[PDB]
Amino acid sequence: MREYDIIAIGGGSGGIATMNRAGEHGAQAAVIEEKKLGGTCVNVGCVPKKIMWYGAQIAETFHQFGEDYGFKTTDLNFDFATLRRNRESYIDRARSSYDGSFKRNGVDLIEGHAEFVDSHTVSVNGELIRAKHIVIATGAHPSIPNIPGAELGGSSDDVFAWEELPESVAILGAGYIAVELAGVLHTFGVKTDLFVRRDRPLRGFDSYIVEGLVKEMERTNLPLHTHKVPVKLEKTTDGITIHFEDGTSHTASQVIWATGRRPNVKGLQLEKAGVTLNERGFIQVDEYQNTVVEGIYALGDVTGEKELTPVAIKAGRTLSERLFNGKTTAKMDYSTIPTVVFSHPAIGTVGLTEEQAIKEYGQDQIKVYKSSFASMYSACTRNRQESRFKLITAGSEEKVVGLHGIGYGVDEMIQGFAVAIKMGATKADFDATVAIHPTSSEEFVTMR
Amino acid sequence: MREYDIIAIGGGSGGIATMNRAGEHGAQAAVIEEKKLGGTCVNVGCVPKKIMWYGAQIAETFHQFGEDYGFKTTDLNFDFATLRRNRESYIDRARSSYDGSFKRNGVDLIEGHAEFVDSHTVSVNGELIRAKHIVIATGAHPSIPNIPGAELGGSSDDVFAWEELPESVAILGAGYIAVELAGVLHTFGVKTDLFVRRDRPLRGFDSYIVEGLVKEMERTNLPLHTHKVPVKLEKTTDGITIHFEDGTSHTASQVIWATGRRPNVKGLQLEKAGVTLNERGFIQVDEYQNTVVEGIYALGDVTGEKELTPVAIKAGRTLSERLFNGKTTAKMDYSTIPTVVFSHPAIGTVGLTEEQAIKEYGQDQIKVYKSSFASMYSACTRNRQESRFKLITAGSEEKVVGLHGIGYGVDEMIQGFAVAIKMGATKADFDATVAIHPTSSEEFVTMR
Ligand SMILES: Cc1cc2nc3c(=O)[nH]c(=O)nc-3n(C[C@H](O)[C@H](O)[C@H](O)COP(=O)(O)OP(=O)(O)OC[C@H]3O[C@@H](n4cnc5c(N)ncnc54)[C@H](O)[C@@H]3O)c2cc1C
Ligand SMILES: Cc1cc2nc3c(=O)[nH]c(=O)nc-3n(C[C@H](O)[C@H](O)[C@H](O)COP(=O)(O)OP(=O)(O)OC[C@H]3O[C@@H](n4cnc5c(N)ncnc54)[C@H](O)[C@@H]3O)c2cc1C
Structure with a gap:
């Protein structure tokens, strides 16, 4: 019993x-x-x-x-x-x-x-x-979408199961897992292609931050393919071929579902x-x-x-x-649950996106602050890597309702700001706090 | 005019x-x-x-x-x-x-x-x-001290003026610049010795964090010499010799005052x-x-x-x-200005040390939360690098009057908490904030 x-x-x-x-x-x-x-x-x-x-x-x-x-x-x-x-x-x-x-x-x-x-x-x-x-x-x-030949495509479970890295790989999906795996396999030297279903990856995340990720993928020659709805998968001598709704097709050793x-x-x-x-x-x-x-x-x-x-x-x-x-x-x-996505470079977010804040507080009630810059780490080399920060305020007192970032060191900076934002922090609370120089995190407390 | x-x-x-x-x-x-x-x-x-x-x-x-x-x-x-x-x-x-x-x-x-x-x-x-x-x-x-031969030693200005790294250097000092330069030059293969006048480096930083730095110095074979009061500097055929009050001496190509x-x-x-x-x-x-x-x-x-x-x-x-x-x-x-020392590894701090908190509020009005661990980054390898985090609270409400850290990624995690601590954050506010996994920063919001 x-x-x-x-x-x-x-x-x-x-x-x-x-x-x-x-x-x-x-x-x-x-x-x-x-x-x-x-x-x-x-x-x-x-x-x-x-x-x-x-x-x-x-x-x-x-x-x-x-x-x-x-x-x-x-x-x-x-x-x-x-x-x-x-x-x-x-x-x-x-x-x-x-x-x-x-x-x-x-x-x-x-x-x-x-x-x-x-x-x-x-x-x-x-x-x-x-x-x-x-x-x-x-x-x-x-999640495995219901289409013909879908069983041929693997998942994130199959990626960690790999004992050796494949020659090529085709990632299908636009979420955080898709972007994380695409960035890692590309940097390890796998012929990595990412296919999103509509418009851009990470449609739930803020556009300004995601635009920074797309720019970084172009700069590192990690091919991103927008407007690619998979209709069918099929076996070939090269490996696995994907057939898309627009007309085109693409082939690789492995295919990963990360929708x-x-x-x-x-x-x-x-x-x-x-x-x-x-x-x-x-x-x-x-x-x-x-x-x-x-x-x-x-x-x-x-x-x-x-x-x-x-x-x-x-x-x-x-x-x-x-x-x-x-x-x-x-x-x-x-x-107000904070999230970090370990892409190349890392994305970090807590609170509402610009569009969420508009529906919540009203269009007229939201102000936005943006900051584009290169980190000192990358900016003194050939390969200048862009960072992008965003703060979203609401009301007359400018309550910080959203904080978003992409760049080197972003993964470790969000936790502290998440504590501040949950307490009801205003723009004035941020601006009163003295910066730590030289860091990337100081940009959040010196926005105009 | x-x-x-x-x-x-x-x-x-x-x-x-x-x-x-x-x-x-x-x-x-x-x-x-x-x-x-x-x-x-x-x-x-x-x-x-x-x-x-x-x-x-x-x-x-x-x-x-x-x-x-x-x-x-x-x-x-x-x-x-x-x-x-x-x-x-x-x-x-x-x-x-x-x-x-x-x-x-x-x-x-x-x-x-x-x-x-x-x-x-x-x-x-x-x-x-x-x-x-x-x-x-x-x-x-x-600052250059007034002792015989003090002119023979340089400062941080001379370190950056260097076109080539010297074979050996002696850093005389206990502050943040001394610790920063000692770490960098040691890592570049220079025979680097650090000489402090009294018990430990970084007086005014929290003992728990400084003890962690001293432990890393000894693990990486970066000699820290304590109770070393320079009485005289002397030019020799070997290099530049420093004579201390205890009767010992040390020789190096360069001597840097960081007092x-x-x-x-x-x-x-x-x-x-x-x-x-x-x-x-x-x-x-x-x-x-x-x-x-x-x-x-x-x-x-x-x-x-x-x-x-x-x-x-x-x-x-x-x-x-x-x-x-x-x-x-x-x-x-x-x-309540935040500070980061770029040691190996980086130290970060905001608010009061444990000594300072006890002096202000009294011994029995102060609760201390500590956490020693190895980061996931170094924990996979031969060389397990230790991180140390510390929170100090005051009163029945447990107002966080001090936050301190040493470890990989600490440089970028302090800014956000500094905003929170400046607003009067309690331990309850820290514990209410959901962790970001897997990071080092999440340790501050899950201490017990
Ligand atoms: C090695 C080192 C590392 C440091 N690292 C950090 C760090 O990581 N983070 C941090 O926050 N701080 C750091 N600091 C401290 C920081 O650099 C200073 O606090 C800051 O630069 C002070 O700015 P200031 O305007 O007061 O003086 P300064 O920036 O020093 O500027 C003073 C200027 O005035 C000029 N001047 C002086 N007299 C005259 C005159 N009669 N006529 C005309 N011009 C004159 C000088 O030439 C100089 O350019 C560091 C300092 C050193 C030495
Ligand atoms: C590739 C990848 C990366 C991720 N990265 C992150 C990250 O960086 N940060 C983050 O916060 N989250 C991440 N996640 C999400 C995170 O793993 C989940 O949110 C978390 O594991 C959820 O925990 P859970 O207990 O709800 O389910 P799980 O941890 O999945 O546990 C469910 C367990 O129950 C077992 N089980 C199921 N049915 C039965 C049954 N009938 N009888 C007995 N046992 C059963 C399963 O075998 C399984 O082990 C990631 C997920 C993936 C796939």
């Missing part, structure tokens, strides 16, 4: 976070996980991507900047197997830390595929498991428990992460409020504070 | 920023400069140092991290002359950019040593220049204007930058409130707003 106070279906960012903090306040917890522990982020997401990004930044330095700083090489050889071995070694050590936290806080790891039997019970390898509280944190999977991600909802027997989906296909929940069935909760990518790791972690930790530390009205705040 | 609404004695950070903003509001302004336009920051300070720091960061990247990211070379070859040429080309262009900003704002560039005649007149090369408003922004000079910087107050005929000095040797001014004489002002390093480039720039711009834009009470806020 198996007795636990609370269980988590899924051992990813959300599941680990919720059960550790539940166990921290003296609850009997259990995590149920199909694949490896740690979920998408540890195994096939944030961690391996960022390690490969750092590798690409070194390749960039060697090839682009080194000569004009007085460094010249003789036989600069890149061994990807060496990077991959050390990438996976770091993931192995990070995955073991999570096992140590389970055992310390009194959380049982149960390897297997969970499946609802009734509203308080789940089935794992035949054996039933019962609990008053059940957290569905099953995460997400890559979006959809929630894991289908293999759970949600009708037996009584758990309903919302209209968009995510698990329906309220502001406190409660499903329609009491005693069952959902959070992380499966609920789809904001598909990020620390969103799942805080949502998870906040839920366990509510259930086991008496914080009755405690809930996740989904506004 | 040439006449102006306002003039600046000195064409550095303070002087240029004051006259450009004065000219922006229609006042006929002029900048008077002895040596090179741009001042200490552009020609022999922030700019050449940061370019050399970036050069050193590339050297660190290839030697310590390259191999484990899959990069190897038959021979890595460094040529300082190429770095210096491009460094000075960037400085040539930055210096040329001021000529464009002068033509827009209507600012005349006068060249020569200025010198007071009376309270409203100066002399440059015999020609008398009268003005209603005179701004003293003469800056500072490297501190003093204001330029002696060449101006300040007695003829009626401008006085305070007990510390700086020009005496009030909170509005007014001297004891009407229509004469002083700002930047010569007044010594906080010796940084953006402090001189903001104070100067605030002064011109007061005089030429009807904002009679406008003044420079000198409290």
Whole structure:
């Protein structure tokens, strides 16, 4: 029968976070996980991507900047197997830390595929498991568009699975994963082509910032192809050929689908428990992460409020504070969540885009500040790399409702500004703060 | 007799920023400069140092991290002359950019040593220049101690003057310039020793962060010598020998004094204007930058409130707003200024140290949050580089009165938090802000 106070279906960012903090306040917890522990982020997401990004930044330095700083090489050889071995070694050590936290806080790891039997019970390898509280944190999977020959194209999971880098690659998609992988593989020397469906990449991100990314792709000869709707994929002697709606076609060794991600909802027997989906296909929940069935909760990518790791972690930790530390009205705040996209160079954003702020406050009520400049790092070399910053203010007092940036060092500067912006910072609060020179971050506090 | 609404004695950070903003509001302004336009920051300070720091960061990247990211070379070859040429080309262009900003704002560039005649007149090369408003922004000079043979040792000016790197150098000092130069030159393969007079470098920075720097110096074999009081310098056949009070001695090709910087107050005929000095040797001014004489002002390093480039720039711009834009009470806020030391790795700080917080608020009203870790960048490699973060809170509300960091990326993460801390951010405001994963900056918002 198996007795636990609370269980988590899924051992990813959300599941680990919720059960550790539940166990921290003296609850009997259990995590149920199909694949490896740690979920998408540890195994096939944030961690391996960022390690490969750092590798690409070194390749960039060697090839682009080194000569004009007085460094010249003789036989600069890149061994990807060496990077991959050390990438996976770091993931192995990070995955073991999570096992140590389970055992310390009194959380049982149960390897297997969970499946609802009734509203308080789940089935794992035949054996039933019962609990008053059940957290569905099953995460997400890559979206494969329904067209002929789509199975021939791989996904982000296949990119980290690669033991050697292919000759060429064709990336289909316009989101953050597409731009990240395109930048990394291009810098490593793979014949990388990116195909977006309409207009430009990152249509949710601010245009001024994305325009800076497009300019950087032109300058590094990373071919971007706009208005490319894929109709069909097909096998050839060269590899895989893509057929587009406009008329043209293109061929490469590998083809990667990176259009979006959809929630894991289908293999759970949600009708037996009584758990309903919302209209968009995510698990329906309220502001406190409660499903329609009491005693069952959902959070992380499966609920789809904001598909990020620390969103799942805080949502998870906040839920366990509510259930086991008496914080009755405690809930996740989904506004003003900062994001960084590790493109070449990195994009950073928090708050509203210009178009979001117009709909929210009114067209007349929004002011905008822009700053184009080159960083000192790149600007004293052949390869001048443009940075672009933007601040969006609202009201008579000019409340900073959006901050956006692309450039060297942007990845590390957003966190502090996110704290300021969530407190209700005005333009006057920014301008009163003295600059740190010489940095790129000082541009945000000296805009006119 | 040439006449102006306002003039600046000195064409550095303070002087240029004051006259450009004065000219922006229609006042006929002029900048008077002895040596090179741009001042200490552009020609022999922030700019050449940061370019050399970036050069050193590339050297660190290839030697310590390259191999484990899959990069190897038959021979890595460094040529300082190429770095210096491009460094000075960037400085040539930055210096040329001021000529464009002068033509827009209507600012005349006068060249020569200025010198007071009376309270409203100066002399440059015999020609008398009268003005209603005179701004003293003469800056500072490297301090050379008074001991036998002190002339044999140079300063930071001489480090940037170098066409070739010497074989060995001895840096005598404990401040930010000593630590910055010691790190850069050590990374470029110069036999570099750092000699501090007392217990540790960087008195006034937080012990936890400084302890982290000392640990990195010892790990990378950059000798730090403590309790080393120079009594004498002596020219020898070996090189230049330093004799210390403890009876030991040390020899090197060059010796660099980095003991501190003093204001330029002696060449101006300040007695003829009626401008006085305070007990510390700086020009005496009030909170509005007014001297004891009407229509004469002083700002930047010569007044010594906080010796940084953006402090001189903001104070100067605030002064011109007061005089030429009807904002009679406008003044420079000198409290809670953020600072970054470009050591290896970079140190960043805003607000109070732990000692300072205890002295202000008392021992039992202060909570301290610490965090020691290795960045993901270095954690994949042989050479695990340690980062150290520290928050200091005060009172029942836990107002963040200090933030400190040392580690990869710290240089760019401070600016945002400085805005937040200046607004009166609490620990609750930090903990409410969602983390950006995977970064180093997220550690500040997840401390427990
Ligand atoms: C390439 C890539 C890069 C990314 N980079 C970033 C980044 O830089 N920053 C960032 O914040 N986010 C990033 N993300 C998103 C981030 O990985 C997710 O938001 C996060 O992993 C969500 O955590 P979760 O717990 O909701 O789901 P997951 O971490 O995916 O965990 C779900 C787990 O549950 C298991 N599971 C599913 N169904 C069952 C079942 N029936 N029984 C038992 N177990 C089950 C799965 O095997 C899986 O391990 C990235 C994603 C990808 C694909
Ligand atoms: C090695 C080094 C590194 C530094 N790094 C940093 C850093 O990273 N960040 C930072 O914020 N700050 C840094 N500083 C400090 C910064 O450079 C100064 O605080 C800043 O330049 C001060 O500006 P100022 O206008 O007060 O004086 P300055 O910029 O020094 O300008 C004074 C000018 O006045 C001229 N002058 C003097 N007397 C006369 C006269 N009688 N007539 C005409 N002209 C005259 C001088 O020639 C000089 O050009 C650094 C300093 C040094 C030495």
